[PDB]
Design a protein around this ligand. Structure first.
Ligand SMILES: [Zn+2]
Ligand SMILES: [Zn+2]
Ligand SMILES: [Zn+2]
Ligand SMILES: [Zn+2]
Ligand SMILES: [Zn+2]
Ligand SMILES: [Zn+2]
Ligand SMILES: [Zn+2]
Ligand SMILES: [Zn+2]
Lengths: 801, 464
């Protein structure tokens, strides 16, 4: 019969092996390291100093320094005498090079803004954790890690009924201290462990072990102490329950099957881990995804309604020819979600595609479809006054539109989820576009309303010209509504101005194309003027940026890229970089003032971060709405010649956040210049007339971060992670912001990965779920699902050898 | 017996104040030349803020002779003030090259035998606080900077036009870096500084051709801010184990990264961990119940460093000789530990406990290193008395106090215990140690610090 005294006594004797094992380990490692001492390498065969004698003077015009030597002997180090001083000649050597201008951190280029996570204020140069709780919790964590591997062998040796790691976990869960645990966490503990702890003596023994352990190892006087509970929380089956990295009739099956894609699939760039969405205070992320606009059903139901309001046979034994191996439920689920998602289509049917996804003949799936008799839910079959300040058919603003809407006023906007209600976009119906702000904003492309239904629905500009158009001062009579709204043209909606071609980065350097047509897609085009880093002409500035080619007034120059951060992250960063203890050393570009988004180029950004302040600048920043991203462009306001330094008026663009918080109580050549110029990476000085360095952007570190973000979801199965990561790694490199270019990149993906996708069943399965999600959104044309069927049947055919 | 001898003060010098205020100059670094043939007279450079003092040491039979002669004395005739050095060699001529780096962010490379500039390495955005040469390639040097990056440089002829071959960047460090160290295999790099993070980086292989840009590394393979609770100013490998020191802690910590072995293949840059959880202050590629990504092993006690920082220790670690850890504090003491004493003590304590039970106390302890063996001592009694051999350097059945003094110095049972120095030598006047260096054969140990002072310790001397 055990007592707390007897268990505590026994744990104390077992605990004696802990310092014994440790001494043995340290001694083992030291002995191993002694044996591994390295032999000296790269020795010269001759002593290189052999010919050099003492330079002590026994000189004329040579600088001299003194040295005083003392000699010592004995055990206490007593001097032999008071010392002897000697004079030595000095060899004076100057350096042959100046340092480059100063900087902190390694400055790396990003193609587009990246989304940061919130950090912890753990270090300030000189909410912070008191160093006392810092030291103490670290001490306890090290001791707990030391003791954890002893618990099971000790329990084995004690062999007390009910003193099981499992039963000690159940006892812990039942105690009142569980003051550290939440609903659903209990359910998952009870899913794995339940609450039955055995016989009464088993429950009694577990209680006395817990008490006895906490007495021996959790003495409150000591710094290194550990509660049994802290050991048990380290357990591999307990820890995931307290890990908060979670991603997430006929239609409930399909809703559940597509949930990873509807939850993580970005509506803008189509990646499942990307730079869009919202980061909450604890770094949980709300993705800018289908779930943001009501999940799959409101969009899918509308696809149905549009379908009910409206080629060759496949090379896989097409059911159009025939129509007739046990089907897995996964295989049946695959046919279910493809069927539901194809919907009431005329041009496309699931059998062929499902047949290419599965390794099955087309007539097989049709025969299985026919016996399944799948039936879609039935879908049920209002006049609204146009607004006096906006006509969406003529694509024109009029009257007091600048007083009627805040559509164009990015500094006051708040980022609500796009419309997904059922009725007209009015205050009565809870539409945030009409009523969430001080003024109505236009409904954008992700709102579920159509331009036919909704007087707030943005429909693009009407501009067209064989010459240049969509210009700031449009000498075409009617202005460009896109320009007026401080937004770039949409490649899909602005059909007349050629934005479809000019916003395509694959045409970025077609100077013929961009010499006419839309001049309002420069951020999407992605081409910057040639610029070169150098030492600024301004004294007390360090680096500056110089034109490396001539720039005419009104041309786009460069984008201000960087990390997107919250207000509080900006405050934390100002502290961490020493800016709060003053002289400004931290520059946070205000992107959306009211929403609280800043752009931070301290580490990641581009050469625009080096442009210096001048009240009379030659370029001008402007915040633009760019297909539901907000971005900062610079436009020349003077003619600028190659070799001249760029400047803009910083104005109020870089607020001190903590201060305002505290207050609330023709090849491209290096140009000729006077200033030294530098390669941004090597910091080698550049020479005029040499080729200008243009280094391709290094993005593989960023792809790794996004891949690992997906790997961290406890919520996702290995098969899901594998496909999501494969698609993301491909699609993030295309930097998509318009659905206009998705079909091209989708078909390139299916072709490059065709052998990979048919090599493993779950890959085609997961690929079909993506396809189903993009079809339900009506963002993937039917024609490319048809083509993808041929690509996969071909690859599967090429594999059978 | 000789293998257990530890150093003693042999020579002392004061170099003229060169940051003149009359005595606020310091020696911040000392480095022995590592490329001389075996047995050559050992040569070290002591780096003050404005000078490199190059000395040869020669053992002497005359205790009144001066073993230290200054053979070269170089002044940085620029405006930079210096605090870091390391040795390299001319790749063509094999002449010694001394690299000196300081507060303007440039490395000067000196041809020390001819007293002229070899070249300058320009590129850092802030002052440089430490330099280390790769043990696997004498032309590869690492520099640690206020700009919070490590730059890796190559002096090989093919890299002459663009000698920065690697930048250790990204977000792994967030403030001034104070210490940089190479693993013996030349592929693993440790870095640490004011942000209290210790980072272990894996370097790629570098092409034997011109590199237009350095390779940029964005993620360390091991990262931790949790071994210390303060700014970290000295880091090194000890084989595969780690030694590190922080301000305010009065310890040198020996610890290890779980799952790290230099026998394993070097990981590639895309194997490194990325900070997906911002609440984790430790992350590791190497990780083999949760427990730990690192294990504290021992703490060498280093009393009276106060609030001082930029104080560096040095291990002597060569085949066939005892490993010796040396470090000087901020109150005129120099400390030594002979790491071989630990296993000998543990062997002695185990023999002692074993014989206590096999003879119920009938045990005689006799000092080793005398003409007397565990055989000659056994013939003086027989099978009734057990004879235990004790290391001579274990100095006082034994009293509780005597046992406690031995344990304080040699017991390795407690990772948060404090191991007392095995030899503690007092320094005349007020002294703060900045750096320690060892001669190739281990007979000389040189400590430099404030007051432009060098303390020169010797063992195995020739004095008669
Ligand atoms: Zn996205
Ligand atoms: Zn078919
Ligand atoms: Zn609405
Ligand atoms: Zn809307
Ligand atoms: Zn609407
Ligand atoms: Zn237009
Ligand atoms: Zn437009
Ligand atoms: Zn346009």
């Amino acid at each position: 019969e055990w007592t707390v005294d007897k268990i505590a006594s026994a744990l104390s004797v077992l605990a004696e092996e802990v310092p014994q094992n440790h001494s043995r380990l340290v001694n083992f490692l030291l002995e191993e390291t002694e044996k591994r001492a390295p032999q000296p390498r790269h020795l010269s065969k001759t002593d290189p100093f052999a010919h050099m004698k003492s330079k002590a003077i026994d000189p004329e015009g040579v600088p001299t320094m003194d040295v005083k030597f003392k000699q010592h002997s004995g055990e206490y180090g007593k001097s032999r005498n008071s010392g002897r001083r000697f004079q030595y000649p000095v060899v004076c050597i100057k350096p042959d090079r100046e340092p480059v201008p100063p900087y902190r951190f390694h400055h790396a280029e990003i193609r587009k803004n990246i989304l940061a996570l919130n950090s912890q204020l753990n270090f300030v140069p000189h909410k912070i954790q008191p160093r006392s709780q810092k030291i103490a919790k670290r001490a306890q964590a090290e001791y707990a890690a030391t003791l954890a591997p002893y618990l099971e062998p000790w329990l084995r040796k004690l062999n007390i009924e009910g003193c099981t790691k499992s039963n000690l976990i159940r006892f812990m869960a039942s105690q009142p201290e569980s003051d550290s645990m939440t609903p659903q966490q209990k359910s998952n503990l009870l899913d794995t462990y339940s609450d039955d702890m055995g016989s009464p003596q088993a429950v009694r023994n577990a209680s006395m072990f817990t008490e006895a352990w906490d007495r021996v190892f959790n003495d409150q006087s000591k710094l290194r102490r550990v509660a049994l509970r802290d050991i048990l929380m380290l357990d591999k089956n307990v820890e995931p329950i307290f890990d908060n990295k979670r991603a997430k009739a006929l239609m409930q099956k399909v809703i559940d099957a597509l949930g990873s894609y509807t939850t993580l699939g970005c509506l803008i760039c189509f990646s499942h881990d990307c730079e869009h969405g919202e980061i909450e205070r604890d770094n949980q992320k709300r993705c800018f995804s289908l779930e943001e606009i009501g999940g799959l059903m409101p969009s899918l139901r509308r696809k149905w309604a549009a379908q009910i309001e409206q080629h060759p046979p496949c090379r896989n034994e097409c059911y159009r020819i025939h129509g007739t191996p046990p089907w897995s439920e996964n295989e049946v689920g695959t046919l279910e979600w493809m069927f539901a998602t194809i919907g009431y289509s005329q041009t496309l049917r699931p059998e062929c595609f499902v047949g290419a996804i599965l390794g099955r003949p087309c007539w097989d799936v049709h025969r299985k479809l026919q016996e399944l008799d799948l039936r879609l839910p039935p879908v049920e079959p209002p006049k609204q006054k146009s607004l006096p300040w906006y006509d969406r058919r003529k694509k024109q603003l009029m009257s007091d539109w600048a007083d009627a809407t805040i559509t164009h006023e990015h500094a006051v906007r708040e980022l609500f989820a796009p419309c997904h209600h059922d009725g007209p976009c009015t205050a009565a119906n809870g539409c945030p576009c009409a009523s969430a702000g001080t003024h109505p904003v236009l409904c954008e492309r992700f709102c579920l309303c159509t331009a036919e239904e909704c007087p707030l629905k943005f429909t693009g500009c009407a501009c067209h010209s064989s010459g240049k158009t969509c210009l700031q001062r449009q000498r075409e009579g009617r202005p460009c509504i896109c320009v007026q709204l401080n937004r770039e043209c949409d490649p899909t909606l602005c059909k007349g101005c050629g934005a479809r071609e000019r916003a395509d980065p694959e045409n970025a350097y077609d100077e013929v194309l961009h010499s006419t047509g839309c001049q309002n897609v420069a951020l999407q085009r992605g081409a910057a003027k040639a610029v070169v880093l150098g030492k600024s002409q301004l004294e007390a500035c360090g680096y500056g940026l110089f034109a490396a080619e001539d720039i005419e007034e009104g041309e786009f120059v460069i984008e201000y890229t960087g990390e997107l951060i919250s207000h509080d992250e900006g405050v934390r960063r100002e502290h961490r970089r020493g800016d709060v203890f003053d002289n400004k050393v931290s520059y946070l570009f205000t992107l959306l003032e009211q929403e609280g988004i800043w752009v931070d180029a301290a580490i990641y950004g581009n050469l625009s971060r080096y442009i210096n302040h001048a009240t009379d600048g030659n370029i001008m920043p402007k915040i633009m709405y760019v297909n539901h991203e907000w971005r900062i462009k610079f436009t020349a306001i003077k003619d600028i010649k190659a070799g001249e330094e760029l400047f803009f008026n910083y104005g109020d663009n870089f607020p001190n956040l903590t201060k305002k918080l505290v207050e609330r109580n023709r090849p491209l050549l290096v140009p000729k210049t006077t200033q030294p110029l530098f390669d941004p990476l090597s910091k080698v000085q550049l020479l005029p007339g040499q080729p200008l360095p243009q280094h391709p952007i290094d993005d593989s570190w960023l792809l790794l971060k996004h891949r690992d973000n997906l790997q961290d979801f406890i919520d996702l199965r290995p098969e899901e992670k594998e496909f999501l990561q494969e698609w993301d790694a491909f699609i993030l490199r295309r930097h998509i912001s318009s659905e206009q270019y998705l079909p091209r990149y989708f078909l390139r993906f299916v072709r490059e990965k065709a052998d990979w996708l048919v090599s493993k069943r779950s890959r085609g399965e997961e690929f079909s779920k993506l396809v189903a999600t993009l079809l339900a959104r009506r963002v993937l044309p039917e024609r490319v699902v048809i083509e993808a069927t041929q690509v996969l049947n071909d690859a599967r055919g090429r594999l059978r050898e | 017996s000789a293998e257990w001898e530890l150093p003693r003060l042999r020579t002392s010098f004061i170099f003229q104040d060169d940051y003149k205020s009359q005595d606020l100059a310091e020696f911040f670094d000392v480095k022995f030349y590592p490329y001389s043939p075996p047995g050559a007279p050992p040569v070290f450079a002591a780096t003050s803020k404005k000078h490199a003092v190059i000395c040869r040491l020669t053992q002497t039979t005359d205790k009144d002779a001066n073993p230290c002669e200054i053979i070269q004395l170089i002044r940085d005739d620029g405006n930079e003030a210096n605090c870091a050095s390391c040795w390299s060699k001319d790749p063509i001529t094999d002449q010694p090259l001394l690299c000196i780096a300081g507060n303007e962010g440039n490395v000067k490379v000196y041809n020390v035998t001819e007293g002229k500039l070899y070249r300058t390495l320009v590129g850092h955005g802030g002052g440089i606080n430490d330099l280390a040469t790769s043990p696997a390639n004498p032309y590869i040097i690492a520099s640690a900077s206020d700009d919070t990056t490590i730059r890796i440089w190559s002096l090989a002829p093919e890299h002459e036009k663009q000698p920065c071959v690697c930048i250790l960047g990204g977000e792994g460090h967030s403030y001034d870096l104070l210490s940089v160290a190479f693993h013996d295999n030349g592929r693993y790099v440790l870095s640490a500084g004011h942000d209290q993070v210790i980072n272990l980086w894996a370097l790629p292989e570098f092409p034997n051709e011109h590199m237009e840009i350095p390779i940029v590394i964005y993620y360390p393979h091991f990262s931790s801010s949790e071994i210390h609770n303060n700014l970290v100013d000295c880091v090194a490998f000890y084989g595969d184990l780690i030694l590190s020191r922080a301000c305010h802690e009065d310890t040198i910590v020996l610890w290890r990264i779980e799952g790290f072995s230099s026998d394993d293949p070097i990981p590639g840059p895309l194997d490194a961990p990325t900070p997906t959880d911002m609440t984790k202050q430790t992350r590791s590629y190497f990780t083999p119940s949760r427990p730990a990504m690192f294990t504290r092993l021992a703490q060498f006690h280093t009393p009276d460093c106060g609030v001082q920082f930029f104080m560096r220790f040095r291990m002597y670690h060569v085949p066939g000789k005892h490993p010796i850890l040396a470090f000087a504090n901020a109150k005129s003491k120099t400390f030594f530990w002979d790491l071989a004493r630990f296993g000998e003590y543990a062997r002695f304590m185990a023999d002692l406990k074993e014989a206590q039970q096999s003879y119920n106390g009938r045990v005689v302890v006799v000092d080793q290193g005398q003409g007397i063996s565990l055989a000659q001592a056994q013939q003086v009694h027989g099978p009734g008395v057990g004879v235990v051999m004790k290391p001579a350097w274990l100095v006082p059945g034994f009293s509780r106090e005597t046992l406690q003094a031995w344990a304080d110095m040699y017991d390795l049972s407690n990772p948060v215990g404090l191991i007392k120095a095995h030899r503690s030598l007092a320094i005349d006047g007020a002294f703060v140690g900045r750096q320690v260096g060892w001669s190739p054969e281990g007979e000389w140990c040189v400590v430099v610090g404030n007051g432009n002072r060098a303390l020169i310790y010797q063992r195995w001397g020739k004095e008669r």
